[PDB]
Amino acid sequence: GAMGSMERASLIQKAKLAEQAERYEDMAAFMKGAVEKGEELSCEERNLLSVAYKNVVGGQRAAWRVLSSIEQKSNEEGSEEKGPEVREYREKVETELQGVCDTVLGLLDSHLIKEAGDAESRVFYLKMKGDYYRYLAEVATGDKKRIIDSARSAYQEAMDISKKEMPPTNPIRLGLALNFSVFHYEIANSPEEAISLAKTTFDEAMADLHTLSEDSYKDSTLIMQLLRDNLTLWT
Amino acid sequence: GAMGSMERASLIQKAKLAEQAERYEDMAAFMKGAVEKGEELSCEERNLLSVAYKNVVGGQRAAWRVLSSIEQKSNEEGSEEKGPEVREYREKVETELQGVCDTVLGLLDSHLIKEAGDAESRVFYLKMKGDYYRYLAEVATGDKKRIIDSARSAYQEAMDISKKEMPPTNPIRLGLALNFSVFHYEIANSPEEAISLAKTTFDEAMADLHTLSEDSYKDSTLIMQLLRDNLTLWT
Amino acid sequence: MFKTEGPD
Amino acid sequence: MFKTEGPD
Numbered sequence: 001g002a003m004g005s006m007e008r009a010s011l012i013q014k015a016k017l018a019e020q021a022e023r024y025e026d027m028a029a030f031m032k033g034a035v036e037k038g039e040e041l042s043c044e045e046r047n048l049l050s051v052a053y054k055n056v057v058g059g060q061r062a063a064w065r066v067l068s069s070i071e072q073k074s075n076e077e078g079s080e081e082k083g084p085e086v087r088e089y090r091e092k093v094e095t096e097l098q099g100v101c102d103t104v105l106g107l108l109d110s111h112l113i114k115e116a117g118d119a120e121s122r123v124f125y126l127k128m129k130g131d132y133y134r135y136l137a138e139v140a141t142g143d144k145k146r147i148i149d150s151a152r153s154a155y156q157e158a159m160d161i162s163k164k165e166m167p168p169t170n171p172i173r174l175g176l177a178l179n180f181s182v183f184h185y186e187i188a189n190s191p192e193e194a195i196s197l198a199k200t201t202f203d204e205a206m207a208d209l210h211t212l213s214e215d216s217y218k219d220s221t222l223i224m225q226l227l228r229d230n231l232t233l234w235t
Numbered sequence: 236g237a238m239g240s241m242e243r244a245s246l247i248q249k250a251k252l253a254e255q256a257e258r259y260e261d262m263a264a265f266m267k268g269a270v271e272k273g274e275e276l277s278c279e280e281r282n283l284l285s286v287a288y289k290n291v292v293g294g295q296r297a298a299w300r301v302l303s304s305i306e307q308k309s310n311e312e313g314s315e316e317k318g319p320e321v322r323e324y325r326e327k328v329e330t331e332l333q334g335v336c337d338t339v340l341g342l343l344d345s346h347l348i349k350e351a352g353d354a355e356s357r358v359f360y361l362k363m364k365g366d367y368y369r370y371l372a373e374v375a376t377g378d379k380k381r382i383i384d385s386a387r388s389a390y391q392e393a394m395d396i397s398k399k400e401m402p403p404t405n406p407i408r409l410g411l412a413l414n415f416s417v418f419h420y421e422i423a424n425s426p427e428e429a430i431s432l433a434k435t436t437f438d439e440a441m442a443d444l445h446t447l448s449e450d451s452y453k454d455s456t457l458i459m460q461l462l463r464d465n466l467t468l469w470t
Numbered sequence: 471m472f473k474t475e476g477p478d
Numbered sequence: 479m480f481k482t483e484g485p486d
């Protein structure tokens with residue numbers, strides 16, 4: 001761990017600076033270093049961890065999709081063989097993406113999840129575990145089935161806790177439901193489950209808005225709009 | 236050189252794929268590998284090299300400016316001392332930026348420039364040498380003077396060749412003049428020289444547009460508009 | 471790409 | 479930042 005010699009507080013400060021500078025690989029490395037100090041993460045710190053790795057893996061997913069599309073075209077009926085380079089480079093990006101997902105899953109398993117007792121932290125980390133198995137599933141082929149079930153299992157455990165312990169407008173609960181619904185649609189080939197979850201999530205949050213402050217209202221309605229965006233594409 | 240085992244043609248192909256995927260660090264590493272094969276670069280290949288490193292160093296410059304601004308604010312009269320972290324992290328980014336500029340300058344000096352005999356290649360590479368010394372100058376303090384004179388010397392040699400060997404609307408000549416003018420304004424503290432060069436460059440290109448095809452006209456007028464944009468900010 | 475939580 | 483040649 002290259003960050004072993006830096007103070008925890010310094011790593012967090014530098015993570016925030018890296019975010020401001022849009023240096024998300026640095027941000028992720030700082031937050032990994034902070035996690036490896038062994039202490040639980042605060043709410044702000046959990047969000048720094050998630051933002052950093054989401055940005056890193058996001059660039060990799062976008063690149064992988066570009067290359068996978070080029071690869072497919074080069075295999076269509078009537079394409080000129082362009083040698084191994086597209087496949088080779090797609091495999092390179094794919095391997096780097098898998099390495100990042102494996103790093104995140106490692107932090108969750110050693111030892112963020114097991115030390116997470118409060119619902120807000122445990123649901124947050126289980127959602128992350130679902131998300132990074134989902135990103136692995138997007139590039140998998142054969143043990144795709146096992147990866148998909150790992151994602152499903154993480155998301156389901158998060159959903160069970162969130163429904164027992166959080167209000168329907170809680171933003172963590174809402175973002176979990178959004179992502180699990182996209183899992184159902186894109187990964188599990190269960191569009192009806194995806195639509196049902198999105199609708200039920202949206203309707204139950206609508207009925208709980210009346211309890212929120214102006215600040216909380218803005219936070220919940222933001223994610224609700226994403227559920228609605230998806231439902232519009234799906235129905 | 237990690238790319239020593241890959242074919243030159245494969246490195247170029249992968250550089251183009253990396254550009255499509257917006258993987259500019261990869262693109263730069265592929266093009267560095269291609270340069271290290273020892274053969275001269277074609278016009279397209281020169282542009283791939285430049286685009287890759289411009290994007291890499293561009294992210295570093297943007298990050299450095301963000302951090303240098305935060306650093307300054309933390310040193311204003313009335314700021315709360317936030318410890319060494321901002322300076323430390325600005326220094327980290329600065330060192331990585333300097334390393335990229337040093338890599339590019341190394342390729343130009345070993346051995347792109349010395350093997351470049353045609354005006355279009357020699358001017359292109361000398362412009363690049365001016366640009367990467369300029370980026371070094373943006374972060375330098377004391378031997379700033381020596382870096383500035385290295386930039387000036389490269390730009391001046393490029394200008395002398397371009398004026399003898401290229402038409403006033405040549406896009407390489409125009410981009411060289413644009414950048415040298417910004418050098419004068421921002422780096423050398425010679426705003427009058429910057430304005431004079433931009434005006435004279437614009438007026439001489441205007442008078443040579445009548446010789447261009449529709450394609451060439453579009454290419455020249457694009458850079459002329461950048462000269463005009465700057466002149467509007469400067470006068 | 472359908473909408474998911476957080477950045478991008 | 480004033481305009482210079484190429485990307486960004």
Ligand SMILES: Cc1cn(-c2cccc3cc(C(=N)N)sc23)nc1N
Nearest residue numbers: 016019042043044045047048051171
């Ligand atoms: C207790 C607490 C929570 N948050 C957050 C909640 C939700 C998102 C988010 C994103 C951040 C970032 N991109 N830096 S922070 C932060 N911030 C706090 N202080």
Ligand SMILES: Cc1cn(-c2cccc3cc(C(=N)N)sc23)nc1N
Nearest residue numbers: 251254277278279280282283286406
């Ligand atoms: C002979 C020749 C020249 N160019 C170019 C001229 C100018 C800019 C530019 C950018 C490129 C890229 N971002 N890939 S290529 C290319 N392209 C060619 N085939």
Ligand SMILES: [Cl-]
Nearest residue numbers: 088089092249
């Ligand atoms: Cl590769």
Ligand SMILES: [Cl-]
Nearest residue numbers: 014323324327
């Ligand atoms: Cl640092």
Ligand SMILES: [Mg+2]
Nearest residue numbers: 090091094095
């Ligand atoms: Mg693979």
Ligand SMILES: [Mg+2]
Nearest residue numbers: 191192193195
């Ligand atoms: Mg149906």
Ligand SMILES: [Mg+2]
Nearest residue numbers: 325326329330
């Ligand atoms: Mg320094």
Ligand SMILES: [Mg+2]
Nearest residue numbers: 426427428430
């Ligand atoms: Mg005057």
